[PDB]
From a paper:
Prion strains propagate as distinct infectious scrapie PrP (PrPSc) conformers that can take the form of amyloid fibrils. Here we provide a high (3.0 Å) resolution cryo-electron microscopy-based structure of infectious brain-derived fibrils of the mouse anchorless RML scrapie strain which, like the recently determined hamster 263K strain, has a parallel in-register β-sheet-based core. Unlike 263K and wildtype RML prions, the anchorless RML prions lack glycophosphatidylinositol anchors and are severely deficient in N-linked glycans.
The resolved aRML structure comprises residues 93–230. As with 263K, the PrP monomers span the entire fibril cross-section and are stacked parallel and in-register perpendicular to the fibril axis with an average spacing of 4.9 Å. As in 263K, in aRML a β-arch of residues ~103–140 extends from the N-terminal steric zipper residues and has an anvil-like head that we previously, and unaptly, described as a “Greek key”. The β-arch defined by the disulfide bond between C178 and C213 is stabilized by a tight interface.
Residue numbers in the entry:
A (entry chain C), B (entry chain A), C (entry chain 1), D (entry chain B), E (entry chain D): 93 to 230
The structure:
């Protein structure tokens, strides 16, 4: 048989920025086995040219067995937490004066602050706290 | 047989920005096995050219067995929490004066603050707290 | 047989921004096995060219068995919580004066604050709290 | 046989922004196994070109068995909660003066605040609280 | 048989910026086995030229068995936390004067601050806290 193939693409612009199987960009993972993933496959396909295939054996007998288990026998956790952001906290004493004229002016200003804030974005503290765990085996 | 293939694409612009199997971008995962995923497959396909296939054997016998179990035997958790944002907190004492004329002016201002805030965005604290856990086995 | 294929696409603009199997972008996962997913497959298909197939064997014998179990034997949880946002909290003392004329003016202002707020966005605290858990086995 | 295929698309603009199997974007998942999903498949198809198929065997014997179980044997939960937003809380003392003329003016203002707010967006706290759980086995 | 192949692409611009199997860029991983991943494969394919294949044996007998287990026997955790950001905290005493004219002006300003903030972005501290764990075996 006679087979003829012709292809003259003009200015082929192909763009592929981010390709991943298990992409974790700018991510924060917690403690005590926070993230558990078995498998992740990503295979994009782009075809532009001529494809000629015949009487082939492409793919057979594919298996994807995955087991993700979370079995702690004796797990003890007293305090568990996480905080992402504590942003834009300010204590300000602002005064603006734009006097343009006057006579015998007496501008007296008094500004006082006493014990404004005691706690701010405070996490996971114990004061005079007692924890008892008597794990005995025989 | 005679087979002829012709393709002349003009300015083919293809764009593929984000492709992933299990994408976790800018994500926060909690504790104690928060996220559990078995499998994740993503395969987009784009075809533009000529495709000629015949009497083939593409794919057979595909299995996707997944088991995700969460079986803690003895799990003890006293305090568990998480806070995402604590934003835009301010305590302000603002004064603006724009006097343009006057005579014998006596502008007296008094501003006082006493114990404004005691707690702010405070999480997961114990004061004089007792926890008892007597785990004994025989 | 004679087979002829012709395709001349003009300015093919294809856009694919976000494709994923199990996409978790900007997501927060809770504790104690919050998120449980077996499998997730996504395969979009786009065809533009000529397709010629004959007497093939594409796909057979596909199985997708998934088991997601949540079986904690002895789970103890005293306090469990999570807060997303605590935004736009302010305590302000604002004064604006725009006097343009006067005579023997006596502007006296008094502003006082005493114990404004005690608690603000406070979560998961125990004071003088006793927890008893006597787990004994024989 | 004779087979002829012709296709000349003009400016094909195809847009695909968000495609996922199990999409969880900007979602918060609760504790104690909040989210449980077996499987999720999404495969959109778009066809524009010529398709010629004959006497094929596309797909057979498809099974999708899914089991999602929630069987905690001994689950103990004292306090469980979650709060999404606590937004736009303000305590303000605002005064505006726009006097344009006067004579022997005596503007005296007094503003006092005493114990305005004790609790604000406070969640899941125990004071002098006793919890008893005597789990004994033989 | 006679086989003829012709391809004259004009200005082929191909771009591939980020391709990875398990991409973790700018990510922070937590303690106690935070991130657990079995496998991740990503193989994008781009075709532009002429492809001629016949009576081949491409791929068979593929298996992807993955097991991810989290089985701590005796796990003890007292305090577990992590904080991402503590940004834009300021305490300011700002005064602006733009007087343009006056006569016998007496501008007296008093600004005082006493014990403004005690705690700020303070995490995971114990004061006078006692922890008891009697793990004995026989």
């Amino acid at each position: 048989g006679t087979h003829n193939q012709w292809n003259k693409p003009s200015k082929p612009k192909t763009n592929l920025k981010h390709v991943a199987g298990a992409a974790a960009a700018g991510a924060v993972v917690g403690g005590l086995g926070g993230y558990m993933l078995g498998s992740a496959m990503s295979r994009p396909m782009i075809h532009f040219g001529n494809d000629w295939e015949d009487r082939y054996y492409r793919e057979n007998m594919y298996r994807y067995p995955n087991q993700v288990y979370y079995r702690p026998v004796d797990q003890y956790s007293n305090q568990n937490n996480f905080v992402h952001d504590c942003v834009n906290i300010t204590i300000k004493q602002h005064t603006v004066t734009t006097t343009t004229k006057g006579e015998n002016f007496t501008e007296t200003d008094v500004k006082m602050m006493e014990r404004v804030v005691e706690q701010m974005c405070v996490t996971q503290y114990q004061k005079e706290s007692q924890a008892y765990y008597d794990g005995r085996r025989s």
